[PDB]
Amino acid sequence: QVQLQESGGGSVQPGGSLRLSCAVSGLDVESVTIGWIRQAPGKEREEVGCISGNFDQTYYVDSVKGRFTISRVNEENTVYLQMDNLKPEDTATYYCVTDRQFYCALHRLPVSQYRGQGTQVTVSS
């Protein structure tokens, strides 16, 4: 059974860096797409970005570009999301999702079969 575990997150002052990690069990992260989505309080599930299985290409939404970076380590079966220059709009709960599909599409990430518990990220003052 596919299992995803999220680690990292917490409270960070405006301006800085954070690193979230998602560990996958029951699958090998070389032929499936892995996406990172976020949920802000009071709003539906938006979506941040994804890394595909096609030649390790990465895609991000228009809102975050040049600030977020997704990387994958296959010998350890891990997916890292490095966030830089954080802003007050980023206070939300982050999940790492997958669908066992060898392709990405940045409008079907919120609706996915498997999903982790998620981690919380706060920036304030």
Next chain:
Amino acid sequence: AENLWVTVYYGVPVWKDAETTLFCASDAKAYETEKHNVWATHACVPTDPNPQEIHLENVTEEFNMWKNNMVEQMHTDIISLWDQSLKPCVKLTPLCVTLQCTNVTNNITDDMRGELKNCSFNMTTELRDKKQKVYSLFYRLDVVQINENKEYRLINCNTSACTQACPKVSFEPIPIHYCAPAGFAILKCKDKKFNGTGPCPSVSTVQCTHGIKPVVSTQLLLNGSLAEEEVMIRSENITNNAKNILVQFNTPVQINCTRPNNNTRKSIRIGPGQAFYATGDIIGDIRQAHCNVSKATWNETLGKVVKQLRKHFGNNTIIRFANSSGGDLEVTTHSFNCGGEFFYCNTSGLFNSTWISNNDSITLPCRIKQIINMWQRIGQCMYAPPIQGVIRCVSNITGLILTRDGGSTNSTTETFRPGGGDMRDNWRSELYKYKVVKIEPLGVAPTRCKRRV
């Protein structure tokens, strides 16, 4: 009368649901003028010109097209057939070099700004003692920047090395019949309002299926088989926004597609009997490939589809079509295989409409790719050699793969977006009326007869 006795019968008409390994059967054609099609027809037995179809009576049989076992076998068959014509031709291992690329502006248009790179690099000749300096024209989609006349590199070979497609073969699909071995039977539901699952009250036993073309596409089914009566909407469970809403048309929509660039190929030697066929100068102006559809025919077809799509989501909702979004060009955009060159067409002028309860032509720009990964797998690619001359083709649109948006919870704004993805749903649209049954001929019945001693 008062007493009955057991009696055994052998050869009784009774079947059960099972699975097996069907075999191929294709038209003979004497296999003389075929220029080694990738879907080789010399690997399976020829068929019978006169088919047989026995119309069973009085019998109702239940079908379920979303748990069919023929789709998996057909997919494995096609993959194994494809991974045999690519074995005996050159593997491009010495192509991983630091290209030096510049832009090309030989009377180019503003639409195709960039998108073509003049790239020069080093290579090994037949004798492993000397080096030759060569150059070629590479599309922008197949080179990524390195060390950020700047240096570039091929996209594929940080992960895997490619296997150049053999140049004589052709990718044109041909019909393939799937026949069942002895001891099994193939049932076909000869209905017209059959939506895919449930009972069928008029079945038939067929010798084996009709010709199924293994055309690989996305977001728009091409060159397929149309349903009678009206359009049909089939889905595994049409209430959940995680499954496709596969649609089959009633009348085809003709689409043309063309690439007008006059291409010239040029061969290089990269070893003892290994050649690499590169592009090499384009004669005249440079224009982008494009596809053409009619407007009235399309909009009439969309009207029919929206008329038949209101039987599930109420008769007062507003039905809004929207384009796709995001990246990964192979899923976002139409991805046919017209004439040996792999296109990717921007389908955003078709899915833009909103329908309330109460000789122009649409043009679609397209891009072309060289390095692709078909039959989605990790560690394998393919390089398609250039094709010389202008390219033209026609096709029939006879299907659709929609997908609901959802998330409104309590609202009437049901929005549909196109979406492809897995290639199994491309073959579930042809094997939706077929079943394999295993026959058990033994039976026991009571009657008045005793074995005399």
Next chain:
Amino acid sequence: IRSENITNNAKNILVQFNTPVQINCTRPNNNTRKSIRIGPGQAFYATG
């Protein structure tokens, strides 16, 4: 005690125990592994 020909010094004398003997053992070195790339999609996990 089992043997094919227990009279000559050219055959084994395989013995089977009646109660097992527990054997522990460890490698106490703390090792770290670093990966390098030697080609198009190949790795040489090497100590380090």
Next chain:
Amino acid sequence: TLQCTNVTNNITDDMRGELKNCSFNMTTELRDKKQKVYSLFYRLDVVQ
């Protein structure tokens, strides 16, 4: 041709030698360039 030296960082007298710090030259993904990766090799896996 590995270029190897001994390692003497907090070693134990019982384990003198038995580990070699070895440097060499390797091809990267692109055929043009080379690296200078180093590793630690046991004595039983290298000969002079």
Next chain:
Amino acid sequence: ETFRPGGGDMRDNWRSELYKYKVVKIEPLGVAPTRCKRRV
């Protein structure tokens, strides 16, 4: 009499497990004498 340990071939590592086992093939035909005649 002096004994020293020694291994070498790995076949003797598996002869210590399959030492009580044998494979036989059954033949189901037999001929016997009795007092009976096939009537004509």
Next chain:
Amino acid sequence: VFLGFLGAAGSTMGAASMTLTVQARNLLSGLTVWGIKQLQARVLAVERYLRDQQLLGIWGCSGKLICCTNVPWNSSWSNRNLSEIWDNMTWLQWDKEISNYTQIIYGLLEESQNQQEKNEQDLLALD
């Protein structure tokens, strides 16, 4: 005439016992793809046919087709009339109805045939 493979799959049980031959005649009908898999399928089909033939032959029905045995018909298996059974029902419904009462009939047939064979062998010795 109602020829054709599985032609009488809807006809009643009374009139579906005439064309028993065709469903039995069309039962044997004997590195790229189609390598080991085809041989595996053919071998499996041959083994299935041989198993069915041996099972039929043990019960005393040596040759083929309609065969009669002693094996008294227990009423509890199906409290049903012969006229309704053989006049207005197809074979599929029958084999759907009697599915859990099958593994006992086979044993009854085997034991009855064994007893009859032993009795005949003993009787032949007297004369």
Next chain:
Amino acid sequence: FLGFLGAAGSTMGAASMTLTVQARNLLSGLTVWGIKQLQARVLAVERYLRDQQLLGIWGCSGKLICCTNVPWNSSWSNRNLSEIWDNMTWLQWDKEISNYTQIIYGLLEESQNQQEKNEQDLLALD
């Protein structure tokens, strides 16, 4: 009851009652397990077919017990009728009668051929 080869030690009289048990399990049932499994299965079905044909030629396929009109030569084994059937085991009988089971088969075949010819001639006569 008694499973596969469950009566291999019982005497002939008791062992001649479970023939169907031993008969039923005579047929039931790239990388490794490739061509070798197919070879084994093909050999098994071929052996079964050969045994069945050899049984059927002599005049048989009533199976199990199948009488014969061939006289029993005393030179093969002349001990008694009770000693064989009350205090002997099928394995011991197989061991005793080993070199003689290549002339009984010919007598069986020739007797069956003669009987069939006689039956056909009698049917043709009237």
